[PDB]
């Protein structure tokens, strides 16, 4: 019975008509304009491809037109269609909107690969490869929407029918959910991965291993760490007496070695610093930015010779010395300006927030639009559908149009080349 699938409340039909026609027309005119500026940009600029932006516009323009027409016709006009004709109209909507998420899926792959393997990115993502991928992605989407027409429906299969969608075997619906859920979850994973990855590299991490006996070099390290705390470093200052040599510097943009000079007859390192000094090769110092500091006294012939021995092994082990050592004579509290001045100099030698906002918005948009829609379908596969939920679905089906309306704003508007191409269409 076709009439069981219809929102029949006249007040509800009107709201369905208002939202559908308003959003659909804005969506049609938006993506139409995007396609217009794509083709004008290709007239004057050879370099920007617009593969993702163009594909998404075609998918949304086609989908909104087929949807809004069939949707208004079915719910407001109560078209009783032959089974196959209805599946045909459903097929267009399914292919276009499945193509829309596939386009978002391929763009997500492009960005994920850029972050995951930035050097190899120029080999794996090529203009010839992208053309083939988008062509195949579109083809798969059409084939997925043609099976009910070919006979993957409940009437020919003699199986349970969907309560949400007329003439739809539940197994086909469950299959279609799994395809879209995998695409959507990867898009979620990719961008969540990118946010995590960017967050770690945002703030630099500093590592101060200090060896002091009477607390002088500790006071220097603590005075140094406080200056780096103001600049927004993630400082971990460790007494040398309690450290693991292996991988000690792992994951640090900057390492600071503060040792005291303690030679009675000849130069000697501070005792707690000595086991760490012997195991420098194990610390993975090679290729790391390091600076040295230390306390001492001018009365002794070798002024801060400990800072000399360390830098000589670090420069030999391959760590890049950012600056020459910091050498203090007498109480460091007297030279506090020289200490804090040093931090600034060594700090001197060496987030993409706007991007971060955009990625979160997409995920918020995606979760808001596809989430509730798919969940109701999951219900229909397993449980029983009452009139209330059917009604909710009709209004939730409108959520997809919204996604089609904001997509030009999210991506096309954000493209620098497109804005230059739009301005190009004016006399100047
Ligand atoms: C036996 C002895 C030997 C020292 N030898 C040196 C030295 O060779 N070169 C130097 O600059 N200072 C030398 N000093 C001075 C110390 O490095 C000074 O006290 C330093 O500030 C200790 O600070 P700390 O508490 O951080 O270890 C020596 C001090 C002592 C008691
Ligand atoms: C309405 C649905 C069911 C059928 C759609 C048929 C036509 C419109 C489809 C089939 C193949 C599709 C093309 C396949 C490849 C791409 C490359 C992409 O970077 C821009 C879109 C573009 C050029 C597609 C445009 C739309 C397209 C030509
Ligand atoms: C009852 C009913 C009659 C007209 C239907 C209408 C449902 C409908 C709908 O409610 C939701 C969707 C979407 C936008 C949510 C896509 C659903 C894709 C499902 C794929 C697996 Br069956 C498509 C839409 O297509 C038409 C033909 C207008
Ligand atoms: C742009 C908007 C989408 C195209 C506008 C779709 C207009 C829908 C008109 C319609 O529903 O056609 C009913 C007609 O009476 C036959 O039954
Ligand atoms: C395997 C290679 C996958 C293709 C990479 C891709 O997705 O290309 C999208 C890009 O946005 C195209 O401009
Ligand atoms: C904006 C969203 C809907 C606007 C349509 C107005 C709805 C009419 C009120 C319902 C009623 O007639 O009781
Ligand atoms: C007819 C349907 C689509 C044809 C319009 C093609 C515009 C997209 C071009 C984007 C691109 O050059 O990659």
From Swiss-Prot:
GO terms for cellular component: actin cytoskeleton; cytoplasm; GABA-ergic synapse; glutamatergic synapse; growth cone; membrane raft; mitochondrial outer membrane; plasma membrane. Its main location: membrane. Widely expressed, with highest levels in fetal and adult brain. Expression levels of isoform 2 and isoform 3 are much lower than those of isoform 1. Residues 73-84, 153-170, 380-391 are extracellular. GO terms for biological process: adenylate cyclase-activating G protein-coupled receptor signaling pathway; adenylate cyclase-modulating G protein-coupled receptor signaling pathway; axonal fasciculation; cannabinoid signaling pathway; G protein-coupled receptor signaling pathway, coupled to cyclic nucleotide second messenger; glucose homeostasis; regulation of metabolic process; regulation of presynaptic cytosolic calcium ion concentration. Residues 40-51, 110-129 are cytoplasmic. It is found in: Cell membrane; Membrane raft; Mitochondrion outer membrane; Cell projection, Axon. Induction: Up-regulated by endocannabinoid anandamide. It is a multi-pass membrane protein. Hemopressin, a peptide derived from hemoglobin subunit alpha (HBA1 and/or HBA2), acts as an antagonist peptide: hemopressin-binding efficiently blocks cannabinoid receptor CNR1 and subsequent signaling. The keyword Cell cycle does not apply. The chain crosses the membrane at residues 14-39, 52-72, 85-109, 130-152, 171-196, 359-379, 392-413. Keywords: Cell membrane, Cell projection, G-protein coupled receptor, Glycoprotein, Lipoprotein, Membrane, Mitochondrion, Mitochondrion outer membrane, Neurodegeneration, Obesity, Palmitate, Phosphoprotein, Receptor, Synapse, Transducer, Transmembrane, Transmembrane helix. One of its GO terms (molecular function) is identical protein binding. Belongs to the G-protein coupled receptor 1 family. G-protein coupled receptor for endogenous cannabinoids (eCBs), including N-arachidonoylethanolamide (also called anandamide or AEA) and 2-arachidonoylglycerol (2-AG), as well as phytocannabinoids, such as delta(9)-tetrahydrocannabinol (THC). Mediates many cannabinoid-induced effects, acting, among others, on food intake, memory loss, gastrointestinal motility, catalepsy, ambulatory activity, anxiety, chronic pain. Signaling typically involves reduction in cyclic AMP. Interacts (via C-terminus) with CNRIP1; this interaction attenuates constitutive, but not agonist-dependent, inhibition of voltage-gated Ca(2+) channels in neurons. Associates with G protein alpha subunits, including G(i) alpha-1/GNAI1, G(i) alpha-3/GNAI3 and G(o)-alpha/GNAO1; palmitoylation is important for interaction with GNAI3 and GNAO1. It is linked to Obesity: A condition characterized by an increase of body weight beyond the limitation of skeletal and physical requirements, as the result of excessive accumulation of body fat. Dysfunction of the endogenous cannabinoid system including CNR1 has been implicated in the pathogenesis of a number of central nervous system disorders, including Huntington disease, Parkinson disease, and Alzheimer disease. In post-mortem brains from Huntington disease patients, a progressive CNR1 loss has been observed in the caudate nucleus, putamen, and substantia nigra pars reticulata, and altered expression and abnormal endocannabinoid levels precede motor symptoms in a disease mouse model. High-fat diet also increases the hepatic levels of CNR1 ligand anandamide, but not that of 2-arachidonoylglycerol. This is Cannabinoid receptor 1. It comes from Homo sapiens. The lineage of its organism: Eukaryota, Metazoa, Chordata, Craniata, Vertebrata. The chain holds residues 104 to 414 of 472 of the full protein.
